Amino acid sequence: SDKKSLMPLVGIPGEIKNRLNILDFVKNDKFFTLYVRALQVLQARDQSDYSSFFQLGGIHGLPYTEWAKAQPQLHLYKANYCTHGTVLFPTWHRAYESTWEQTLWEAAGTVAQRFTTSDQAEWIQAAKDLRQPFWDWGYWPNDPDFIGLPDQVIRDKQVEITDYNGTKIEVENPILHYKFHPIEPTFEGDFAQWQTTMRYPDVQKQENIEGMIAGIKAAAPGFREWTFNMLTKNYTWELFSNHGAVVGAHANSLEMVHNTVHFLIGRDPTLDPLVPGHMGSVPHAAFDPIFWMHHCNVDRLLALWQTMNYDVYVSEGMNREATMGLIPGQVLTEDSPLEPFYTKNQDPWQSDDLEDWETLGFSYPDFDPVKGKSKEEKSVYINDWVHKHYG
């Protein structure tokens, strides 16, 4: 056998803490400063370092290299690690989101030790409570101008954070872009030519941010109704979990709604030919820092559906496309491996092990009022909440 992975997925130790709504998160100066600082560290790391931003984003699609393996394969199937169009879409991405979260959290830990003000203890406590925030793309408070993302995520070239001696400073915004160093050699097309990640490109290959924002606001009432249908009309894992063997046939799935969200950021639908940026392209999406806010919400919506539909989990499905860790033609189940994620016991993670998200050290503020309550009570309450929040 021998050791398999150099960076086990273990999640976050200590008390369970919430992943916050990005709108709330940015208002907390301690969480926001630590996130920006932690993100600076990750992004500045050598791109061959497996704990780097580049490598973490690298797992999802390109480059088609093994991640954090102590021993290479003899013949590597060069493909995405991510699983899409399969019963394992939700659970693989839960594991992926926690791999990121733990790496960010470890970085935030070292950062907090550098504060030298009289409130340093508060900075230290903040770092261990820190979790990855979510963009609730399905919420629309009947306000045409409402945007679910703050300027710190989508507009500001520089952001105000608190420096270690307690002083106010501006820094280049690590959330707005990732600057490659260098661009991945195996990127082709526009991606070979783009130095940073790019959102909502135009014909000239430049970012059209206001076009993107206009499109989000316009789509938002459509997304309320669609999210609600996705949460409340799916009763089985098959219809909920993935977009179908013909991509589109499961129109109401979590995956399909999630697909459209990628295109809101990554791809202007009016352009002809289409010109997607990183978020509009599966092999490149994970390099954009907003990928993690998007996926934090996909995991939240999963957590909400699971609560209403308790003990309705992964059902057997076919694997049609070979992915770096999955055999083409094999049957997929709750005991199928989720490469490249390993436990500290050097076993592969299974959907099995992460049905209970609290096992990875997080929850969502939605579940605060139902702590310690019965499955049935939790299901009722959350069903009322979903009707209030997305109805």
Binding site: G317, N319, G329, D335
Partner: protein, 136 residues
């Protein structure tokens, strides 16, 4: 809403199996009975298990270097290693052996003029008779 399973192919030919110690897994282009060409491949311990939907037989390591369909599952002869060959979408189905090195599915006639069935020989990385494709 039942699973289609997969075809196991070598070139244009596909793996078939019929009922009845152990029956031959025949690679050709004529399906003998309903779903005799369809296989359920599952994760099993550190490897895979390979079940024929038509015959209800498991593919197993058999007496004297052959691969046969048997009706009762045996963890010691029915667990397989499936490894990527290095080109296209072709893999090797391999006998599980500690620190690697096991024999692999090798599709060839018993003598001459057929029929073409599965044997277990040493891996030749350049041999076409050992390259497997799956299609759902």
């Amino acid at each position: 809403l039942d699973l289609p399973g997969t075809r196991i192919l070598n070139g244009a030919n596909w793996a078939n199996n019929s009922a009845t110690s152990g029956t031959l897994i025949i690679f050709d282009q004529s399906t003998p009975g309903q779903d005799a060409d369809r296989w359920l491949i599952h994760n099993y311990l550190d490897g895979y298990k390979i079940f024929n939907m038509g015959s209800n037989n498991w593919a197993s390591v058999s007496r004297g270097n052959t691969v046969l369909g048997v009706s009762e599952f045996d963890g010691q002869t029915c667990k397989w290693s499936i490894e990527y060959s290095g080109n296209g979408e072709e893999f090797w189905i391999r006998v599980p052996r500690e620190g690697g090195g096991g024999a692999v599915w090798t599709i060839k006639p018993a003598s001459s003029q057929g029929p073409t069935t599965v044997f277990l020989d040493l891996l030749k990385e350049t041999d076409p008779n050992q390259r497997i494709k799956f299609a759902v």
